[PDB]
């Protein structure tokens, strides 16, 4: 704990995004912020509803802050499904990132959760009440196979947040514990699977592909956040519970011999996300390559994890790692950092009240 | 390999025996044959029923073999929870099994899905009809944590054999393939988080023994039956795809490197589950130390996994494994090797044509 350790988050980093073969970038800025605002104006438009603004208890900024956030990760990462795609994930995605707010036991709203699915009677829970509303939107994009991986996802989210009320980091000696919870609110499946629309691909045509991509992809999604997420968690308790930190708890090792393995584990993905599909179908390998790069580019750009306080500390160094830090770095906000006044607006309160 | 590692095999059944803590209990023949035919009777009668004969498609035979191999696993793996409750399981666990029969593709059945699913309309697909009807008979007996874990590792498992009609062991270099189809269909959360039936446990007061014992369980359960199951899908050509052989062909390593692997997680999980769970409550140990008994003594005991060759092909051997082997055998026979005539009657078929 205390100092960062600052060069490896950057080695590992570098790793990284030479491995990913960090090519330049997805979209021109133009095509980017024509996106931005195409899925946050649908969105904030949706979650300014009246309905939704009544069953979706979380605070105005909050929600601001959340559908910005989302919004660009999807429009980032997603760099190759239409405007329409990217803004129906974007509401899916922001739904469940809100969720992660509730402090409200799922219990008491959960006790009758099969009995009233199975006769379609409007759930308890509010959440699930407005997701499953909503669903429909964002399912009409894809086939039956991918759909049925969204949904599953979606309800191991659920269940993954139960758990994370708990504030519980495993018990010592249970190794299984960590990537058991990693992986029930990675939303894995979800991500995976929501990167071949229909429209697109041919779930029966590139099944053995999609379903390759799903296995790994949400790993490489997952550990890749868990690594640009350490740093603005690496001073921050109020966000005890963490992969890294329940390596700690669980695994009973120090914290970096806990951040060594995710860094193993992230470079081995990468590695073999390359090896698997470079030689399959070129629109396969381009939605993943895509993808990748983005996600990558967005946790860079994205004020959230605070990435520019490593740039300032690592600007006049002159290391094979320091260098290749900004080196990719800038490269990112060259095409990804965009101020939101470009393409967030009006703010969703805004809607809302008119 | 050509030979079968009877030596390597005999000693690492032996190392996980021991770990275990396998020894005798007090759950007498004279209960077992009790619960035996309590479950399966219930079960025979429900198989029997004009509508469950008619929407599922399956070998009278083949029902009537998995019918009777899912009663005892239930009732010498749960041996703590209610008649009832071992009876329930055992129709829903029926149901999974047999549904690995189906090699109708999935796909136009699960088109509608979630719009079915949403409105309240029955499934098109006729196991998804038959499973959501009589779900509530097993999900009663739990609370709704612990419910929410079987519905989702139902649908997991549905994917699972969707994915399994493909015969995909994985393309090489895809490590986290076979790891992820395992966990796919193997239950693992329905089988941990039925354990605790709220009659018997409080889910909000041993949240966090519950969920630890999900997360580990899981494994265990998998692992475990991968090992014993080893010996039988050893010469079976018509086994292709399975745990152990996707390590082969995904991780591109030998079948002992694989089954070398196998080994490793299996010792390990079985050390962890007690150094975990030993010194928690009493009575959620002793669920654990029970099931992982029972289960391990019904491998040794149904025919199905061709276990007493080994057996007798070692019997007459003075090695310290080989010894060590036959009494932990002979333990599991005494206790819980039965004769069908004794419980399994009359055949599902006869009920059905009655
Ligand atoms: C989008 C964020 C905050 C992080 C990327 C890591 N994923 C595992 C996310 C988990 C939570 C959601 C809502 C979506 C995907
Ligand atoms: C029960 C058999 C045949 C094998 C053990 C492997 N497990 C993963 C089972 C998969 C099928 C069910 C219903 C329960 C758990
Ligand atoms: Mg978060
Ligand atoms: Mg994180």
Redesign the interface.
Same mark, same amino acid.
């Given at each position: 704990m205390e100092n960062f350790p600052t060069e490896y988050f950057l080695n590992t980093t570098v790793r990284l995004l030479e491995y990913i073969r960090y090519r330049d970038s997805n979209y021109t800025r133009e095509e980017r912020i024509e996106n931005l605002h195409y899925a946050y104006n649908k969105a904030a438009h949706h979650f300014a509803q009246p309905r939704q603004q009544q069953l979706l208890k979380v605070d105005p900024k909050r929600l601001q802050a959340s559908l910005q956030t989302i919004v660009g990760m999807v429009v980032y990462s997603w760099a190759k499904v239409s405007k329409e795609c990217m803004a129906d994930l974007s509401i899916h995605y922001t739904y469940t990132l809100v969720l992660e707010d509730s402090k409200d036991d799922?219990?008491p709203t959960?006790?009758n /959760?099969?009995?009233d +699915?199975?006769? &379609? %009677?409007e759930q308890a829970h509010p959440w699930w009440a407005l997701v499953?509303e909503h669903?429909?939107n964002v +399912?009409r994009h894809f086939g039956? #196979?991918c @759909? +049925?991986?969204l949904? %599953?996802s979606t309800?191991?989210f $659920?269940?993954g947040c139960?758990?994370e009320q /708990?504030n519980?980091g &495993? $018990?010592? &000696? @249970?190794?299984?514990?960590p990537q #058991?919870?990693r992986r029930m609110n990675g939303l894995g499946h979800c991500v995976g699977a929501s990167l071949w629309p229909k429209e697109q691909f041919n779930? %029966?045509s590139l099944? +053995?592909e999609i379903? @390759?991509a799903?296995?790994?992809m949400?790993?490489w999604m997952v550990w890749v956040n868990d690594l640009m997420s350490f740093y603005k968690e690496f001073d921050d308790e109020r966000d005890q519970i963490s992969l890294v930190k329940n390596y700690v708890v669980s695994d009973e090792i120090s914290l970096h011999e806990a951040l060594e393995k995710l860094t193993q584990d992230t470079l081995? @993905?990468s590695k073999?996300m390359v090896?698997?599909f470079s030689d399959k179908d070129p629109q396969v390998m381009d939605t993943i390559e895509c993808f990748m790069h983005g996600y990558v580019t967005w946790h860079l750009c994205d004020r959230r994890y605070r990435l520019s306080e490593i740039y300032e500390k690592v600007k006049e160094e002159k290391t094979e790692d320091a260098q290749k830090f900004c080196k990719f770095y800038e490269q990112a906000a060259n095409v990804g950092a965009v101020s939101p006044s470009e393409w967030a607006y009006p703010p969703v309160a805004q809607l809302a009240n008119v």
């Open positions: 799922p219990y959960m006790v /959760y099969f009995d +699915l199975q006769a &379609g %009677r499953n669903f429909p +399912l039956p #196979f @759909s +049925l991986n949904i %599953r309800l191991d $659920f269940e139960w758990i /708990y519980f &495993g $018990f010592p &000696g @249970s190794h299984d514990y #058991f919870l779930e %029966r099944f +053995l379903t @390759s799903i296995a790994q949400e790993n081995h @993905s073999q090896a698997v």
